[PDB]
Amino acid sequence: PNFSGNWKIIRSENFEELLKVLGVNVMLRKIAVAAASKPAVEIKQEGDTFYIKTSTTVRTTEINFKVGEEFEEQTVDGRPCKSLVKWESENKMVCEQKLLKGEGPKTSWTLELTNDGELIETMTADDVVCTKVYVRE
Ligand SMILES: *C/C=C(C)/C=C/C=C(C)/C=C/C1=C(C)CCCC1(C)C
Ligand code: NA
Ligand code: NA
Protein backbone atom coordinates (compact mmCIF):
# COMPACT_ATOMS: atom_id res chain seq x y z
CA PRO A 1 0.00 0.00 0.00
CA ASN A 2 1.00 3.63 -0.40
CA PHE A 3 -0.40 5.70 2.47
CA SER A 4 1.84 8.68 1.65
CA GLY A 5 -0.02 11.92 1.19
CA ASN A 6 -1.23 15.20 2.51
CA TRP A 7 -4.68 14.09 3.56
CA LYS A 8 -7.66 16.35 4.07
CA ILE A 9 -10.76 15.45 5.92
CA ILE A 10 -14.07 14.82 4.21
CA ARG A 11 -15.99 13.07 7.04
CA SER A 12 -15.82 12.98 10.80
CA GLU A 13 -18.10 10.89 13.02
CA ASN A 14 -18.48 10.45 16.76
CA PHE A 15 -15.52 12.44 18.07
CA GLU A 16 -17.42 13.85 21.06
CA GLU A 17 -18.55 10.47 22.27
CA LEU A 18 -14.99 9.16 22.03
CA LEU A 19 -13.81 11.97 24.27
CA LYS A 20 -16.69 11.33 26.69
CA VAL A 21 -15.62 7.68 27.11
CA LEU A 22 -12.05 8.81 27.62
CA GLY A 23 -13.28 10.92 30.54
CA VAL A 24 -12.65 14.38 29.08
CA ASN A 25 -14.78 16.88 30.96
CA VAL A 26 -17.55 18.77 29.25
CA MET A 27 -15.81 22.14 28.80
CA LEU A 28 -12.62 20.58 27.41
CA ARG A 29 -14.72 18.39 25.09
CA LYS A 30 -16.48 21.45 23.75
CA ILE A 31 -13.14 23.06 23.10
CA ALA A 32 -11.76 19.94 21.40
CA VAL A 33 -14.80 19.41 19.22
CA ALA A 34 -14.74 23.01 18.08
CA ALA A 35 -11.02 23.09 17.35
CA ALA A 36 -9.95 19.54 16.52
CA SER A 37 -12.73 18.13 14.39
CA LYS A 38 -10.88 18.91 11.12
CA PRO A 39 -7.36 17.49 11.39
CA ALA A 40 -4.88 17.53 8.54
CA VAL A 41 -2.79 14.39 8.27
CA GLU A 42 0.58 14.10 6.52
CA ILE A 43 1.92 10.62 5.96
CA LYS A 44 5.33 9.66 4.59
CA GLN A 45 5.74 5.91 4.06
CA GLU A 46 8.88 4.01 3.04
CA GLY A 47 8.03 0.33 3.10
CA ASP A 48 6.89 -0.49 6.60
CA THR A 49 8.40 2.73 8.06
CA PHE A 50 6.05 5.60 8.68
CA TYR A 51 6.06 9.25 9.65
CA ILE A 52 2.65 10.73 10.47
CA LYS A 53 2.02 14.35 11.37
CA THR A 54 -1.45 15.34 12.54
CA SER A 55 -2.29 19.03 12.74
CA THR A 56 -5.11 20.90 14.45
CA THR A 57 -5.02 24.38 15.99
CA VAL A 58 -4.93 22.84 19.50
CA ARG A 59 -2.48 19.98 18.92
CA THR A 60 0.17 19.11 16.36
CA THR A 61 1.69 15.63 16.73
CA GLU A 62 4.38 13.73 14.91
CA ILE A 63 5.00 9.96 15.22
CA ASN A 64 7.62 7.73 13.65
CA PHE A 65 7.26 3.95 13.67
CA LYS A 66 7.95 0.71 11.94
CA VAL A 67 5.13 -1.76 11.59
CA GLY A 68 5.72 -4.54 14.13
CA GLU A 69 8.05 -2.54 16.42
CA GLU A 70 6.90 -0.93 19.62
CA PHE A 71 7.12 2.84 19.93
CA GLU A 72 5.89 5.52 22.34
CA GLU A 73 3.27 8.13 21.64
CA GLN A 74 0.15 9.41 23.43
CA THR A 75 -3.49 8.55 23.45
CA VAL A 76 -5.96 10.91 21.85
CA ASP A 77 -6.64 12.38 25.32
CA GLY A 78 -2.93 13.06 25.72
CA ARG A 79 -1.72 10.21 27.99
CA PRO A 80 1.64 8.62 27.27
CA CYS A 81 1.42 5.13 25.86
CA LYS A 82 3.34 2.32 24.22
CA SER A 83 2.04 1.48 20.77
CA LEU A 84 2.41 -1.37 18.30
CA VAL A 85 1.13 -1.25 14.71
CA LYS A 86 0.38 -4.42 12.72
CA TRP A 87 -1.04 -5.09 9.30
CA GLU A 88 -4.59 -6.26 9.89
CA SER A 89 -4.71 -6.70 6.12
CA GLU A 90 -2.84 -5.53 3.07
CA ASN A 91 -4.38 -2.08 3.14
CA LYS A 92 -5.18 -1.67 6.84
CA MET A 93 -2.97 -1.03 9.83
CA VAL A 94 -4.09 -1.36 13.42
CA CYS A 95 -2.35 0.18 16.42
CA GLU A 96 -2.88 -1.16 19.94
CA GLN A 97 -1.96 1.25 22.77
CA LYS A 98 -1.04 0.54 26.40
CA LEU A 99 -0.76 3.32 28.96
CA LEU A 100 2.65 3.90 30.52
CA LYS A 101 0.99 4.67 33.83
CA GLY A 102 -2.40 4.14 35.38
CA GLU A 103 -5.57 2.65 33.91
CA GLY A 104 -8.15 3.71 31.41
CA PRO A 105 -10.26 2.61 28.50
CA LYS A 106 -8.69 0.30 25.94
CA THR A 107 -7.56 2.52 23.04
CA SER A 108 -6.51 1.83 19.50
CA TRP A 109 -6.37 3.48 16.09
CA THR A 110 -6.51 2.22 12.53
CA LEU A 111 -5.74 3.48 9.05
CA GLU A 112 -7.16 1.87 5.91
CA LEU A 113 -6.78 2.76 2.20
CA THR A 114 -10.02 2.23 0.33
CA ASN A 115 -10.48 1.23 -3.29
CA ASP A 116 -11.69 4.73 -4.17
CA GLY A 117 -8.44 6.50 -3.20
CA GLU A 118 -9.58 7.56 0.25
CA LEU A 119 -8.23 6.95 3.74
CA ILE A 120 -10.34 5.77 6.68
CA GLU A 121 -9.01 6.51 10.15
CA THR A 122 -10.57 5.20 13.29
CA MET A 123 -9.90 5.85 16.95
CA THR A 124 -11.49 3.60 19.55
CA ALA A 125 -11.98 3.74 23.29
CA ASP A 126 -13.53 0.61 24.72
CA ASP A 127 -16.48 0.01 22.38
CA VAL A 128 -16.83 3.59 21.05
CA VAL A 129 -15.39 4.38 17.62
CA CYS A 130 -14.62 7.70 16.00
CA THR A 131 -14.31 7.51 12.21
CA LYS A 132 -12.62 10.02 9.92
CA VAL A 133 -12.35 9.84 6.12
CA TYR A 134 -9.78 11.71 4.07
CA VAL A 135 -8.79 12.30 0.47
CA ARG A 136 -5.41 13.66 -0.64
CA GLU A 137 -5.47 17.44 -0.98
C1 LIG B 1 -8.41 12.31 14.41
C2 LIG B 1 -8.67 12.85 15.73
C3 LIG B 1 -7.86 13.76 16.30
C4 LIG B 1 -6.62 14.22 15.62
C5 LIG B 1 -8.16 14.23 17.62
C6 LIG B 1 -7.47 15.22 18.23
C7 LIG B 1 -7.86 15.61 19.56
C8 LIG B 1 -7.34 16.64 20.22
C9 LIG B 1 -6.22 17.43 19.63
C10 LIG B 1 -7.82 16.89 21.56
C11 LIG B 1 -7.29 17.81 22.30
C12 LIG B 1 -7.66 18.19 23.66
C13 LIG B 1 -8.15 17.30 24.57
C14 LIG B 1 -8.36 15.84 24.31
C15 LIG B 1 -8.38 17.71 25.99
C16 LIG B 1 -8.39 19.19 26.22
C17 LIG B 1 -7.23 19.85 25.49
C18 LIG B 1 -7.34 19.60 23.99
C19 LIG B 1 -8.38 20.49 23.33
C20 LIG B 1 -6.03 20.07 23.36
NA1 NA C 1 4.48 -2.49 3.34
NA1 NA D 1 8.27 -7.07 13.81
Q: Which amino acid would we find at residue 53?
A: K
Q: What separation in Å is there between the alpha carbon of 85 and the centre of ligand 3?
A: 9
* Length of the chain as a residue count: 137
The CA radius of gyration of the chain, in Å to the nearest whole number, is 14
> Which domain, by its residues, includes 6?
1-137
Q: What separation in Å is there between the alpha carbon of 47 and the centre of ligand 2?
A: 5
Calpha distance 87→74 (Å, rounded): 20
Residue nearest to atom 18 of ligand 1 (CA): 32
Residues around the ion ligand 3 (C-beta < 5 A): 68
Calpha distance 41→20 (Å, rounded): 23
Calpha distance 69→89 (Å, rounded): 17
Q: What separation in Å is there between the alpha carbon of 26 and the centre of ligand 1?
A: 13
Report whether 108 contacts 114 (CB < 8 A): no
Q: Which amino acid would we find at residue 11?
A: R
3-state secondary structure 57-73: CCEEEEEEEECCCCEEE
Report whether 46 contacts 33 (CB < 8 A): no
Residue 29: strand, helix, or coil: helix
Total domains in the fold of the chain: 1
Calpha distance 112→105 (Å, rounded): 23
- CA-132 nearest atom, ligand 1: 1
Residue 135 β-bridge partners: 8
CATH number at residue 77: 2.40.128.20
Nearest C-alpha neighbor of 137 from the set 12, 41, 1: 41
Residue 27: strand, helix, or coil: helix
Calpha distance 66→49 (Å, rounded): 4
Residue nearest to atom 20 of ligand 1 (CA): 58
